């Protein structure tokens, strides 16, 4: 098997920049004088995407911004000049020896200015009250970077281990992110109690910001 | 133009056995190679099959052999992939893909995801999230679909009939200790609408046949 180790494994640039995502295979991808290197470009939800063939040929429909190049166990993947669109996995593919492999992959952020999140927050709904559990939402809605803080605070007690945080991909349009923090508390806890609040630092807020509720 | 429609997946016993399909259209599909590749959730592309123009020739990894069969019928231009005893590891997203002359993949199916396990399918509740009269970040109004307690994946949020793109975010589902999944969906709005429009957000799970249409409203 041909192993395939891509470098580096996350890359972080601004747009307009000039990114360079590296492959180096274990053995040879040379023969009957050609490199059987591909590369693909998978986002969210999506397949690969065929960028480059054969090594250097570019996939027609793909952006000029977009070549590649090396032979033998060297390769070089291009980006000349980023777009927020361009954020996705990048894979190198060998397709000469017996077992077809692809690199681990490569993760491309666009690096984005500083945005803040906007919060919002929301009580758990009618319905579910009727059900014996309670559900608190806190939303981080487009911000930048990514690393964000969010306590809960139920009367100014400090939650702990009982909260799940689920972040969606970068945007491809403006490069932001979101943010959704879910605090799970029995029907009973809920209503035995009044005010809910959720607390987010982020580099884009000067100061820590508090979004919260009193029951009913 | 050159498409390729995977059907087929969904959950499955370990164990168990399931066929994966592939109906090409728009391109000669005798003349070509096909591919099978699956990516586990979270990690990378693995090759899992490959099968000549006509048939005659088939190559599978060791992890694969003697388990899984790939074939093809041209007078149907499908491609298919028999499974069988399937385990944990197996559950991924399986793509199908055409093989060009020049050695490179250009033509893939949106993919299929298999999850293979025992736990048995849930259908999703949907509760509202309603933007609430203090929130006010000025002209813009965030609401909401929350579906929790579902199996497996995954689930498709959407708001208005598909009509409501802009703006709306359904984040990744995240895994409960309970054993079943939950996501949220919201999409921020002008304020001056809120009462003004109706908003609608349309669930859909089709491991469980449930079609749910949430109205939300502050």
């Known amino acids: 098997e041909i192993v395939l180790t891509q470098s580096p494994a996350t890359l972080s640039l601004s747009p307009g920049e000039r990114a360079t995502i590296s492959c180096r295979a274990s053995?040879?991808?040379?023969?009957?004088?050609?490199?059987?290197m591909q590369w693909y470009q998978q986002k969210p939800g999506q397949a690969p995407r065929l960028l480059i063939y054969?090594?250097?040929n570019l996939e027609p429909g793909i952006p000029a911004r977009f070549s590649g190049s090396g032979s033998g166990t060297d390769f070089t993947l291009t980006i000349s000049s980023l777009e927020p669109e361009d954020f996705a996995v990048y894979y190198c593919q060998q397709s000469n020896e017996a077992p077809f492999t692809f690199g681990q992959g490569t993760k491309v952020e666009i690096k984005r200015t500083v945005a803040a999140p906007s919060v919002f927050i929301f009580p758990p709904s009618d319905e579910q009250l009727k059900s014996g559990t309670a559900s608190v939402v806190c939303l981080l809605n487009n911000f930048y970077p990514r690393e964000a803080k969010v306590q809960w605070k139920v009367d100014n007690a400090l939650q702990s281990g009982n909260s799940q945080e689920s972040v969606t991909e970068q945007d491809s349009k403006d490069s932001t992110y979101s943010l959704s923090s879910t605090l799970t508390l029995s029907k009973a806890d809920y209503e035995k109690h009044k005010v809910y609040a959720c607390e987010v630092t982020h580099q884009g807020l000067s100061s820590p910001v508090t979004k919260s509720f009193n029951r009913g | 133009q050159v498409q390729l429609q995977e059907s087929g997946g969904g959950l499955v016993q370990p164990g168990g056995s399931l066929r994966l399909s592939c109906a090409a259209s728009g391109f000669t599909f005798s003349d070509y190679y096909m591919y099978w590749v699956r990516q586990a959730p979270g990690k990378g592309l693995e090759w899992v099959a490959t099968?000549?123009?006509?048939?005659?020739?088939?190559y599978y990894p060791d992890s694969v052999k003697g388990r899984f069969t790939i074939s093809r019928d041209n007078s149907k231009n499908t491609l298919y992939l028999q499974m069988n005893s399937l385990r944990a590891e197996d559950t991924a997203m399986y793509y199908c893909?055409?093989?060009?002359?020049?050695?490179?993949?250009?033509?893939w199916g949106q993919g299929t995801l298999v999850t293979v396990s025992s736990a048995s399918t849930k259908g999703p509740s949907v509760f509202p999230l309603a933007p609430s009269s203090k929130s006010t970040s000025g002209g813009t109004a965030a609401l909401g679909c929350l579906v929790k307690d579902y199996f497996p994946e995954p689930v498709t949020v959407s708001w208005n009939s598909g009509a409501l793109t802009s703006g709306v975010h359904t984040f990744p589902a995240v895994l409960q200790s309970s054993g079943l999944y939950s996501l949220s969906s919201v999409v921020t709005v002008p304020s001056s609408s809120l009462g003004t429009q109706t908003y609608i957000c349309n669930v859909n799970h089709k491991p469980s046949n449930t079609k749910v249409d949430k109205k939300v409203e502050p």
């Open positions: 053995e040879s991808v040379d023969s009957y004088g050609h490199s059987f």
């Open positions: 099968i000549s123009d006509g048939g005659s020739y088939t």
């Open positions: 054969r090594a250097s």
């Open positions: 893909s055409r093989y060009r002359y020049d050695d490179a993949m250009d033509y």
